[PDB]
Amino acid sequence: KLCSLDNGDCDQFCHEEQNSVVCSCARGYTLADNGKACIPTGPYPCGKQTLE
């Protein structure tokens, strides 16, 4: 079911390359080693409310 199954376990963008799940992130985020999570690069990444 890939991307249709809970967003392919992706944090953000989910695509299908060669009938396989491929995750990606928005600008300012780097794909984690597990190829699923999105890690911010600065203290104010996009889409995150500022709570501190």
């Binding site: 953000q12 928005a26 999105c38 203290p43 104010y44 889409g47």
Partner: protein, 234 residues
């Protein structure tokens, strides 16, 4: 914003406010990056010269987190028309970069296909602004937000006296008294996914505000992603 709730500290950091010569807000915007603001093309005809304020939550007094930015270049979609309100989108490049901080951060731009299949299919989105809290009233002094349900595209076309183009989508309530309103135009409509907020719409128009049998109309950001990327480069 009619109904909804006040934006608490840090909850709507991507909200931008276009202010006229009198330093009063007349439209909203969404922060996309340190140099760019997304808003509605029809807002450009609400004031000759305007600036952009970010980090504001209460227009009554200055707390110290607000920042005003002058607009360097205005990029309005050439196809926008007041006769249809289609292609209601514009991008503003600022003269100086926005400094991100508490209450000041960009909303994420999603990819097209993913957004349409994963974000636009969610049950709700969030709209915000310093707009009127009633169809008849003055601009709110406090930034508000409202969870608005995505509306079936056919049900909304049938409920509208104006043609809903493919560059538009509907969100809101049929009878419940909550909706965006005058002044919220150009503002953000974001959809949450795993605690990350992506810009999905631009407050565009509506027949009155929160009227029974009527919905809020927004510009579909996914129909202009290529246009936006281009504009953020030119």
């Amino acid at each position: 914003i009619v109904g909804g709730q006040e934006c608490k500290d840090g909850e709507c950091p991507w909200q931008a406010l276009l202010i006229n010569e009198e330093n009063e807000g007349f439209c909203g915007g969404t922060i996309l990056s340190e140099f760019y603001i997304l808003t509605a093309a029809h807002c450009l005809y609400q004031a000759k010269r305007f600036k952009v304020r970010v980090g504001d939550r209460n227009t009554e007094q200055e707390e110290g987190g607000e920042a005003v930015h002058e607009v360097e270049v205005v990029i309005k979609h050439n196809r926008f028309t007041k006769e249809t309100y289609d292609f209601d989108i514009a991008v503003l490049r600022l003269k100086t970069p926005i400094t991100f901080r508490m209450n000041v951060a960009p909303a994420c731009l999603p990819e097209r296909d993913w957004a349409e299949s994963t974000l636009m299919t969610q049950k709700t989105g969030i709209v915000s602004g310093f707009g009127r809290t009633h169809e008849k009233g003055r601009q709110s002094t406090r930034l508000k937000m409202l969870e608005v349900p995505y509306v079936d595209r056919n049900s909304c076309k049938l409920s509208s006296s104006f043609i809903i183009t493919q560059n538009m989508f509907c969100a809101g309530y049929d009878t419940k008294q909550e909706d965006a309103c005058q002044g919220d135009s150009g503002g953000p409509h974001v959809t949450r996914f795993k605690d990350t907020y992506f810009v999905t719409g631009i407050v565009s128009w509506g027949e009155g505000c929160a009227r029974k049998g009527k919905y809020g109309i927004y510009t579909k950001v996914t129909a202009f992603l290529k246009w936006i990327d281009r504009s953020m480069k030119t």
